[PDB]
Structures are given as structure tokens and as C-alpha cells.
Design a binder for these strands. Structure first.
Lengths: 159, 160
DNA sequence: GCCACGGGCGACCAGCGGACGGTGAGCAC
DNA sequence: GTGCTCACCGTCCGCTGGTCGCCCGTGGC
């Protein structure tokens, strides 16, 4: 498998141009990973093995073997909060992307910018970020990062 | 010395004391209740610290229980008798009548264990072979990992 | 061609879930 | 004690989930 093109900040309907991938692509990867999970579940059930509820190393292995190693653990864990903000607050995810673009910032920056509206979101639902993940059917299958929980708790602690 | 080694289990009628240097089955089942309480504690603690919050009885929860002076709630034992506990949660009457029978015949815990599998497999088959589903349906079972062996045996009954 | 800009993902690790049988307690006579 | 019953639970192991920072692609010159 060839090393994949770097991501760049994008708008909801906007294409990436050069040797670069867009954010809508990024989000699609999570959809694909969900489908691969579903496959792995069906296979496991037919073999009579344990059936995973989350996107595990097993599911990554499956995706890779199906020729999609670009869906790998490091990357997926890296941009989860972004994906979460997209699933939970479409409008906000979008308008933020717009802004980050207008200012001309990198993915690394956009990442950080995604944390804060998510923390706001958690605070509005009794600080229960883990609850938010378990509520949305497309987030249910992703482990909630330590860092997000921490940052929610620190906003609880300071404000 | 966080605990002296515990008395062996013996087959028991629902509510029989289990006289001797021996523990009964209702005690066995109580251990799972205690483990659930310790899980609940660990959850509350984690939430107040802002750490990750477990949904199942993990090594962390066992460590907690041990530190609270209940190392008799340990992973090997708990994983050993889960299907028994599951049958108890899902089919009280059956769990009971089975215990009665195993007693009347005069069997050891090791035997009663095996006898517990089969009504459970029947149970799974009646809910589209989804034993993992059964665990996730009952609010007292959702906190326990489903053993490989139970899944296998459900699948073999599907196959044979 | 040089060389910095920045991120995709290899690789390592701490600890988990699983699993077994070694030790050691239990018993009726 | 006797010989012997038999299960509690330490202990080890193969991964997993998390982590992070290199090596490599990429770009303006």
C-alpha cells in the first residue's frame, strides 16, 4: 500500500485539489470503518466467535486486508473528536471549518479548534461526554479518548 | 495478607446455609452483586477525577474490591461461574430446580457448572442464538464479559 | 537540487482479559 | 492422622488500546 496524501482544511462541499485529501474524505473513513466493523461482526457470528461492539485492532486488520489500510488506528484515534463534533453538531463543525479555512490554518490547528465546541456540548448534557458518544449510533463504536474526557473535566473544574 | 484463602463452594438449595468450612451458592451469587456495587463506586470515583469510566467488571474493579477488603471477589473465580450467575439472572426458577436436582443426586460444584450451560444454550436459541444479546439485555449481566466457551457452545448447538 | 513544513502511520509498551492447574485445605472414619 | 477429594486463586501469557514521534512526502525555489 502507498503512503496516503496529507489532509487539508475543507468546506462541506469543497473538493481537495493537489496531492492532498479533504475533510469530507476524512469523515468518510469513519463510515467505512463502521461498515468493516459490521462485516467483522457478521463473520464472527457465523464462525461462533466473540462479536466486537467497537472499532478494534481486529477491525483495522480486516479493513487492511480488504485493501484499506489507510483506515489505521493512529489516524482514526487522532481525529475522533473532529468526527464527533461532525456527528453531534454538523452546523458548528462546518462553520468552524469555514473559519479555519478563511484564516488559512493547517489540520493540526483545526484539530485543537474542534475540542472546545465539543466541551461546550458536553457541559450542556451534564458534562457526560462518554454519554454523548454512547447516545449517537455512529459514535457508539469509537473509544472515547482520555484527552477529551480530561478537557471536559478541566472545564468543569475551572469554570 | 489482604485475605485468607476462602472456603470451597458446595451445591445448595435456594436459601440453605451450607454448614461446614464451605460456602453456598447464594453466597456465590451475592459476590456478583458486591462486584456490581464496587463497579458503581469505581465509576463514581472516575467521574469525579475526570478519568475513563468502565462499563464492565474490569481488573481495575477487582483491584478496588481487593483494596476494600474483598479479594475473595477475584477475576478467576468470577469468570469461572458467570454462566451460573447468568442462568440465575435470566431463569431463576430453572437455576433453582437445577440446584435442587444436583443436590438430590449429590454432585460437586464442578458438575453443577456443566449442567448450567445447557438451559442457557436453550435460552440463547430462543432469542435467535444471540447469547451476547441476552447478557446486554439484562441490566445485571451487561457488566460481565461473555465467556468464549458459552459463545462456542451456543454455536455448536446451532451447528450440531 | 536544497531544504524546511507538517503529518501519516510504524513501533513500542503498560496493562488487560483470559486461562490453567499447583497448592492447599477438607472430610469421614 | 489416614488416604484422598477438588476448587481457590496466583501467575503467566498473547494480545490490545494508547501513544508519539520518525521518516517521508511536499512545496517553493
Amino acid at each position: 500500500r502507498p503512503r496516503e496524501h496529507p489532509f487539508v482544511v475543507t468546506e462541506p462541499g469543497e473538493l481537495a485539489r493537489g496531492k492532498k485529501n479533504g475533510l469530507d474524505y476524512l469523515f468518510n473513513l469513519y463510515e467505512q470503518a463502521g461498515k468493516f466493523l459490521e462485516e467483522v461482526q457478521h463473520i464472527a457470528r457465523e464462525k461462533g466467535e466473540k462479536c466486537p461492539t467497537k472499532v478494534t485492532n481486529q477491525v483495522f486488520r480486516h479493513a487492511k486486508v480488504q485493501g484499506a489500510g489507510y483506515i489505521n488506528k493512529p489516524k482514526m484515534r487522532q481525529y475522533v473528536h473532529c468526527y464527533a463534533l461532525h456527528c453531534l453538531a454538523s452546523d458548528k463543525s462546518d462553520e468552524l471549518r469555514r473559519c479555519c479555512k478563511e484564516r488559512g490554518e493547517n489540520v493540526g490547528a483545526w484539530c485543537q479548534a474542534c475540542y472546545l465546541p465539543l466541551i461546550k456540548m458536553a457541559k450542556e448534557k451534564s458534562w457526560d461526554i462518554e454519554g454523548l458518544f454512547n447516545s449517537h449510533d455512529k459514535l457508539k463504536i469509537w473509544y472515547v479518548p482520555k484527552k477529551l474526557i480530561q478537557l471536559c473535566h478541566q472545564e468543569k473544574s475551572k469554570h
